[PDB]
Amino acid sequence: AELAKPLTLDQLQQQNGKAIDTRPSAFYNGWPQTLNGPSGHELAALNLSASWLDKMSTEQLNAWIKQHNLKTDAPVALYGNDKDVDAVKTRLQKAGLTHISILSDALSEPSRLQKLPHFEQLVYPQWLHDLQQGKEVTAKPAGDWKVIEAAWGAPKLYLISHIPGADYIDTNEVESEPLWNKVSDEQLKAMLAKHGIRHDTTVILYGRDVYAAARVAQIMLYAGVKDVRLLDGGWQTWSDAGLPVERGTPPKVKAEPDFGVKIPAQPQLMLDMEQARGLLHRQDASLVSIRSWPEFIGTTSGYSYIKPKGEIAGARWGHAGSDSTHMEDFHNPDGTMRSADDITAMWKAWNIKPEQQVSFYCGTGWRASETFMYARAMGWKNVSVYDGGWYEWSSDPKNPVATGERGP
């Protein structure tokens, strides 16, 4: 049951092996474990956090092994803390892998590590707690910062428990009837003022569901908030970390009546219907459906208030989740963002590529916003959300619709 012979990264490469980073994804993504410490993962490494194992069945681990092209007998070299490495070793042995070593020089050359181009946009619980406690942290906000819980409607779960010092935003403050598109620039200006946000205020959003926070975030980026971040995995990661909480009604926030730039500062982050239409049938652009497969093939609209079924003709499938309110294809077993390499591969399979102008949509914009935030953190330079989505598109029967089982 012991590890095979240790391998350096160069040895591993010359033997066509794979490295596996057993740390939580925050560190894999680039967050250092200590200030000014190593940032990222070894080249081409996979992330298999030991903390996920109690939420991964045999089938799920077998699926993961298959999805990552791990050959039964090819060398795998693990790194991370000793306990996590042992835990992962044991599961991989029981899964059938026959050549499991330690990566002997792992993290010893900080210069050779790989990270998310903007990992600092996807924060994690300890970081936020340390920030709140006045400690020095990596990628600290330049100045003022706010933490905000986002959800639909008046505060519910927030009243019972929330992150200390967090404000609350009802998603109905940023979008409305009749199409569930974002509110006007003037209404956004009012919302920003009321929640004490200037263009140079860092905003960290979280939700019980990530997509609620992402929706608010993407609309803030459009408006012109420069530094907008998400808590990766949302509230549940804070809860599971055992960190302190607060309760009750949202505290009074000092208003900021002057945003400091003209809204919207980043209008290119949102597309309208005609702009979205313009991305279709191209190799240098993709209009990407973040809808469940039953929605993509036209079995269900995904929404009680959307009668038309089908998909935008020419739209490429971006993956999503099991139904219209889930996003499993983008999440690790702990709810955090799946590795950039894996997201990249699933998009590449549908001809969605970083050099393209890429716009994401869904029924009304929430799931598309989550993918927008991930692509932004991944360094994709030309991404947006087509706000109207299927609700708008299908409101006109003349707009071309695709239906049924089909492929790239």
Q: Tell whether residue 367 is among the known ligand binding residues.
A: yes
- Distance, in Å, from the CA atom of 210 to the CA atom of 208, rounded to the nearest integer, reads 6
- Distance, in Å, from the CA atom of 202 to the CA atom of 185, rounded to the nearest integer, reads 20
- Distance, in Å, from the CA atom of 343 to the CA atom of 116, rounded to the nearest integer, reads 12
Angle at 94 between CA 92 and CA 100, to 5 degrees: 40
- In order, the DSSP letters of 141-181 are -SS-EEEEEEESSS-SHHHH-B-TT-EEEEGGGTEETTTTE
Helices (H) and strands (E) in the chain, counts: 14, 18
Between β-strands 175-176 and 181-182, what pairing exists: parallel, antiparallel or unpaired? antiparallel
CA distance readout (Å), 173 to 3, 167, 190, 352: 55, 13, 10, 32
Strands (E), 276-351: 285-289, 311-312, 316-317
Residues acting as catalytic residues: 362
Between β-strands 270-271 and 122-123, what pairing exists: parallel, antiparallel or unpaired? unpaired
Residues that constitute the known binding site for substrate:
367
